Each structure stands twice: as structure tokens, then as C-alpha cells.
């Protein structure tokens, strides 16, 4: 099936508590496989997956070096952006960066991504053509012109189309037993009288894919939360009560070819 | 046009002293680097910066320190000079992952004492009559001797004008006493011309040598004159 | 100071020689764990000014100047520099370099020596005076073939200079030259450059 590799970077200063905190994590689809934290003692890229620990030392060295370069880049960026938005010094501010790629069932290049946010808001993003940028506000337009003259998209393009997919492929080939799991989820439902009115909920659990919850006529508005992880590798989620006593159907997943 | 600058090009300084090399850049580059070049011409990264508020280690020792608060400036500091610091120090700027642009460089020599600093002795040797009679060419030789800091620039000047054609100066000066660390150096240059040209007493020849030594900023308490930056030359006329 | 140095670039030959004109090739191999990187060749003349020769982007399909060619083999990780019709002005230190976002890593470098075309060699050792009530004098070995090798005397009070190529633009003439001098009394034009081998056609003046 389709797959994706994502890196998430976060940098946040403090009012007067030294250097900024820096966090980086790597995900294959929905499985975290690497981590980095500036406040961590190792000061190195650590494994977060089973089949990722078989990589050689030169790999772990390279990644530790590069992620540290990202930190230094963000270290600089934080100073810059505080000026762009004319923000105070004692204020704590956040920089988020994410990039990655997608592939098809044939494991060939599909999509590439690269995005950037300051204080939770979009700052700039590489367009789908991977040849142009989208500035959020006029401040970001400065950065745009800079990277256009700097041919940044050209560099990032080479990475996403090439390196990113190649190693994503390498990753799948090694974590096959663990990563390509679409084992069927668990369902079941609860029920509890509230007298004339009784509680009813729809539960879904134990599903490795994260993507996912009603008919009497399907209606919106009323219906409501986000998917939750289990911590082991699976996920779970639930979704309405109506004043009745004599009950109705709940509603499709990838690991299943449902109503009960 | 935009370029990269760093000063001085030459510097001699006593051991156990604080140093500051400024590096200027006007290309709007965010990345900047400092390299030391050995007498073996090998390049060693000292420090670098991704931009303002960023400083990255190349020197595992604490002898060197940098600080980037402005994009156009990237000064390099050495708190206390050591003989081993005697080397060439190159600054560079970089757009992105692209090539970096290097400055003219800074030539450093750390000496145990500034007493060891001396200006050169310039002298011109007239072409050989045999050489003239044999080759019909006239070769003048210039020799600079007795200068300790190997920071010099020789040039030939014919009738008030500097020349490049027919000139060949040695690549680098030669040390007098190899065993001695702070030994004086020597250097030679050649100027060859036509016997016709040389044989004209109207033609004036001047071997010029720009020496780089101490500045007004340097302290001098010795009896002999202060060996500051200066020019020394030796002259010779044509012979009928 | 203490510097760290990774084993990325390899330039096997530190010194190299080629006859003027003609072609010479500077080899360079490297070992990296990354797929994305830039490659550079730098030139550093006696002026010690570093000068970019060429930038090769690994993802830019194959090579893309004048006398300066390049053979980029991504699979073999080889990256040689070919210089056709070597001019004397090309004589310099040449550095193969590996670059990423963080920094550029340089090789130990190669020194290139260009040998001038001596059409009509004529070895001779002349003695020259200062012509100003001097103390001493000097001896000039010149007009010898480029292939000739100059050595250093086996003594401390005598000094010798290496081959230096002169170029008379107007006359289109080139000449190698070497100088020697001392303050000892047993020094003479005759026993000059004895430690090194010199041609037998060498001319020695007496008057």
C-alpha cells in the first residue's frame, strides 16, 4: 500500500533559561523510529524502532551531525523571527519544521513535503511542484525571495525525490514484519441507562493504521475526538447518546474487507 | 561589487598575548568559516557560524574563540599567543551549500620575543660581463637577508615603473639556521633583460622590498630601532 | 589548538609535475555515507588565494570549462581534475573538497609543478658583484633544462636557491635560474652546486 516518512522538528526558547530546547522525531507512517532532544544527556540520535538499531555507526554519526546542524539553523532562525514579528526578548517562542515524502503501492515517488511554522502559524511551504514556495504573510515573502535566489527548492527536490524515497524503501524492506501490519481492529459497544434515556457508544481499538467513526440517516453537528495510540504500536478511537430504551448501526477500515 | 576582507594580511606578535583577526564580508552570506593552514598547506576548520547567535567548534582547545552578532563580521580571537599558532589563517563566507568565498588571508608568526624581529638587508648584483658576452642577456639579482618575520614583498622597478616581465622571485624565503625556531630568513629575485637595455646608463634599476613588521601599537624597549613595517630597496644603473 | 579531521577526501599524490602545455590529471577519491553533497576543486597560487575551479552538484546529471575538465564517477566516488595545455600560470596547490550544509572538507591537496619549454638549453654559472664596496658576491646557475634538479649543499654557511622560471614576454623567452652565496673564503664559482648533478656542457667563467 501507500507509505510515508516524516521528520518533525521543534525549537523553543525560554524567558531566561539558557539555550533553547530542541526536539526532533522521525516517523515511518505512524511508527516513531528515531528521536533527538537537546535536554537529553546522550546528545545523540536515539533509536525508537526495532529494525532501526541494525544501522551502522557511520549512519548514527551522520544523523547526529545533521540534526545538530538543524538545531543551529533553528537557533539562528529564532533570533531572526523575533525581529520579523517585533517580539520581546523575555518571551518564549516556538519554531516548527516538518518535511517528508509519500510513495505508492509500487513504492515509487508520490509526494514530497516541506513546511515551516513560527508560533504555531504557517510561515512558508514548498509547493507541490517542488519548485516554488508559498509565503504565509508579507514577512515570510522575504524568506521566499532569499530561497529562490538560493535555489533551495532545487536542493530539497533532489533529496525528496531521491534520498528520501530510497531510504524509505530501505526502511520498509527491513521493518517488513512490523511496519506492514493492517491487522483487524476490535469493536464492541457499551450501554448505560441515563431512565427513558440510555447511553450508547461506538468503540474501535487495536488497529495499526491510524486513519479511520453512524446511521439511524447520517447527520453531522452533534456527532463528535481524535485517534489515540496504545503505546505498543496500535491505535484506538470512539464516537452518540439518544433518549431511547429499545434499540441503529455504527460505521470501514483498510485491514477489513462493517456493521454489527 | 561585494567581496570578503580580513586584516591584517601579515602579523608578528609576541607569545602570551591576546589576538584578534577581523573578517569582513559584504555578500550577505549567512554562513562563515575560519581555517588555519599549516606549513604543510593542510586546512583545519577552526570555527564557523550558521548565522547570528550561532558558533560552532572546530578547535577542540579553548585557545580560540569566536562570536557572531553581525552578519558582515566574523572576528577570530586567540586569548594567548603560542608558537604553534604561527600559521596562515583564512576566512570564508558561504551562500548555502555552495562554494565558499575566501579572503586574502592573514599570515601569522608568534615569536618568543619581539627582540627576534629584524628588517631585511637589500642588495642588487650587476649582470656578469661573461653572461653578456655569452648570452647577450643581462641578469640582475636582488637579495634580501637578515629579516626574521618572513613577511615581505619584492618587486622590480625600471625607471620608476614596476615590472613583471622577465622577473622570477623565489616561491618563499629560506631560513638561515634550520635548527633555530626563530631564525632569520633570506629571499632572492631575478630580473633578466637584453644586454642592449642593461648597457644603457640612462636605465635605472631598483629592487624594491615591502617589509611587514611592527606597528605603532607594538611596544619597543630595546636599544636598536623599532622594526616596523617599511620598504627597503637597492639600486643600480646601466653600464656602457 | 586541537583540530578534528574526518577521513573523507583522498588525494594520493601531494606533488606532481607536468611539462608546459600538454595535459595532467589530478586524482581524487572520497568516502561518504551521504547521497547528497557538493564537490569542488580549489586552486591556491603562491599568492595563497583560494580560487574555485569547479562546482559539481552530485544530483546535477554528469559533468557540465576551457582547459579544465572533470571526470565525475558517482558510483566509483572518483572525482579527478584534468588540465589540458598546462600553462605556467597554472602551477599551484590544488584541493579536492567535499561539502554539505554544515561545512566543506578539504583534502591534503596536490602541488603542481609546470616545467617550461626550454627549446635551446645552455647551462652556465656566472659570478656577480654588488658593485657597491660589497663584502661578498653570488653565483648564478641559469639557462639549464627544466628537467635539471637543484640540491642543497652539505653545509650550514652556504645557501642555495631552487629553480625559478623567468619569462621574457616580448622576446617570448624562458629561462630557469638558481643562485648561491655565502660568507666563507673557500667558496667559489667553480665548486658551486657540486652536491647536485649539473650538465657537462656547463660553462665556467674565470676572468
Amino acid at each position: 500500500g501507500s507509505h510515508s516518512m516524516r521528520y518533525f522538528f521543534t525549537s523553543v526558547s525560554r524567558p531566561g533559561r539558557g539555550e533553547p530546547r530542541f526536539i526532533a522525531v522521525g516517523y515511518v507512517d505512524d511508527t516513531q523510529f528515531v528521536r533527538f532532544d537537546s535536554d537529553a544527556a546522550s546528545q545523540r540520535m536515539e533509536p525508537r524502532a526495532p529494525w532501526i538499531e541494525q544501522e551502522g555507526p557511520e549512519y548514527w554519526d551522520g544523523e547526529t551531525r545533521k540534526v545538530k546542524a538543524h538545531s543551529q539553523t533553528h537557533r539562528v532562525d529564532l533570533g531572526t523571527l523575533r525581529g520579523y514579528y517585533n517580539q520581546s526578548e523575555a518571551g518564549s517562542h516556538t519554531v516548527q519544521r516538518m518535511y517528508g515524502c509519500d510513495v505508492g503501492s509500487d513504492w515509487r515517488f508520490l509526494r514530497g513535503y516541506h513546511q515551516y511554522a513560527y508560533d504555531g502559524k504557517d510561515y512558508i511551504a514548498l509547493k507541490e511542484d517542488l519548485r516554488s514556495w508559498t509565503a504565509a504573510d508579507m514577512a515570510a515573502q522575504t524568506t521566499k525571495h532569499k530561497w529562490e535566489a538560493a535555489h533551495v527548492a532545487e536542493q530539497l527536490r533532489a533529496y525528496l525525490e531521491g534520498t528520501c524515497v530510497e531510504w524509505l524503501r530501505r526502511y520498509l524492506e527491513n521493518g517488513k514484519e512490523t511496519l506492514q501490519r493492517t491487522d483487524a481492529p476490535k469493536t464492541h459497544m457499551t450501554h448505560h441507562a441515563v431512565d427513558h434515556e440510555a447511553t450508547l457508544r461506538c468503540w474501535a481499538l487495536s488497529f495499526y493504521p491510524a486513519e479511520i467513526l453512524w446511521q439511524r440517516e447520517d447527520q453531522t453537528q452533534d456527532t463528535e475526538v481524535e485517534t489515540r495510540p496504545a503505546g505498543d504500536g496500535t491505535f484506538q478511537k470512539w464516537a452518540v447518546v439518544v433518549p431511547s430504551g429499545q434499540e441503529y448501526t455504527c460505521h470501514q477500515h483498510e485491514g477489513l474487507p462493517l456493521t454489527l | 561589487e561585494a567581496d570578503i576582507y580580513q586584516t591584517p594580511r601579515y602579523l608578528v606578535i609576541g607569545t602570551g598575548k591576546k589576538i584578534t583577526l577581523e573578517c569582513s564580508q559584504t555578500m550577505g552570506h549567512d554562513k562563515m568559516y575560519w581555517y588555519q593552514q599549516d606549513p604543510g598547506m593542510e586546512l583545519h576548520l577552526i570555527h564557523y557560524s550558521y548565522g547570528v547567535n550561532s558558533t560552532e567548534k572546530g578547535d577542540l582547545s579553548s585557545e580560540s574563540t569566536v562570536s557572531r552578532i553581525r552578519t558582515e563580521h566574523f572576528p577570530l580571537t586567540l586569548e594567548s599567543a603560542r608558537p604553534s599558532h604561527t600559521s596562515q589563517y583564512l576566512c570564508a563566507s558561504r551562500r548555502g551549500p555552495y562554494e565558499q568565498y575566501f579572503g586574502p588571508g592573514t599570515r601569522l608568526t608568534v615569536t618568543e620575543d619581539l627582540k627576534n624581529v629584524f628588517p631585511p638587508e637589500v642588495a642588487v648584483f650587476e649582470p656578469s660581463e661573461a653572461e653578456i658576452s655569452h648570452t647577450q642577456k643581462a641578469t640582475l639579482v636582488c637579495l634580501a637577508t637578515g629579516f626574521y618575520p618572513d613577511h615581505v614583498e619584492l618587486s622590480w622597478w625600471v625607471n620608476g615603473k614596476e615590472v613583471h616581465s622577465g622577473v622570477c622571485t623565489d616561491p618563499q624565503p629560506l631560513k638561515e639556521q634550520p635548527a633555530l625556531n626563530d631564525s632569520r630568513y633570506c629571499l632572492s629575485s631575478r630580473l633578466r633583460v637584453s644586454a642592449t637595455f642593461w648597457q644603457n646608463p640612462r636605465n635605472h634599476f631598483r629592487c624594491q622590498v615591502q617589509f611587514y613588521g611592527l606597528s605603532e601599537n607594538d611596544e619597543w624597549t630595546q636599544d636598536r630601532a623599532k622594526p616596523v613595517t617599511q620598504i627597503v630597496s637597492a639600486e643600480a644603473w646601466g653600464r656602457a | 589548538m586541537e583540530f578534528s579531521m574526518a577521513q573523507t577526501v583522498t588525494q594520493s599524490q601531494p606533488e606532481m609535475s607536468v611539462q608546459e602545455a600538454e595535459t595532467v590529471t589530478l586524482s581524487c577519491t572520497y568516502d561518504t555515507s551521504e547521497s547528497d553533497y557538493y564537490l569542488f576543486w580549489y586552486k591556491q597560487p603562491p599568492s595563497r588565494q583560494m580560487i574555485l575551479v569547479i562546482r559539481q552538484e552530485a544530483y546535477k546529471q554528469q559533468n557540465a570549462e576551457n582547459r579544465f575538465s572533470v571526470n565525475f564517477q558517482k558510483a566509483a566516488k572518483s572525482f579527478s581534475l584534468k588540465i589540458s595545455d598546462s600553462q605556467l600560470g597554472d602551477a599551484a596547490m590544488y584541493f579536492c573538497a567535499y561539502g554539505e550544509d554544515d561545512k566543506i572538507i578539504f583534502g591534503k591537496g596536490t602541488r603542481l609543478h609546470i616545467l617550461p619549454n626550454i627549446q635551446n638549453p645552455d647551462p652556465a654559472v656566472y659570478q656577480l658583484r654588488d658593485s657597491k664596496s660589497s663584502d661578498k658576491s653570488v653565483c648564478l646557475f641559469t639557462d639549464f633544462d627544466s628537467q635539471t634538479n637543484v640540491s642543497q649543499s652539505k653545509d650550514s654557511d652556504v645557501y642555495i636557491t631552487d629553480k625559478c622560471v623567468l619569462d621574457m614576454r616580448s622576446m617570448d623567452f624562458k629561462s630557469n635560474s638558481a643562485v648561491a652565496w655565502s660568507n666563507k673564503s673557500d667558496f667559489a664559482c667553480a665548486n658551486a652546486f657540486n652536491n647536485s648533478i649539473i650538465p657537462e656542457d656547463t660553462f665556467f667563467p674565470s676572468p
Binding site: 545533521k66 539553523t73 532569499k146 533551495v152 | - | 554539505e100
Partner: peptide, 10 residues
């Protein structure tokens, strides 16, 4: 594998 080439400052 992280970006080795492309990361620039804003």
C-alpha cells in the same frame, strides 16, 4: 535519513 543538503536559514 535527514537532509544533508538543503537546510538554509530564513
Amino acid at each position: 535519513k535527514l537532509v544533508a543538503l538543503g537546510i538554509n536559514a530564513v
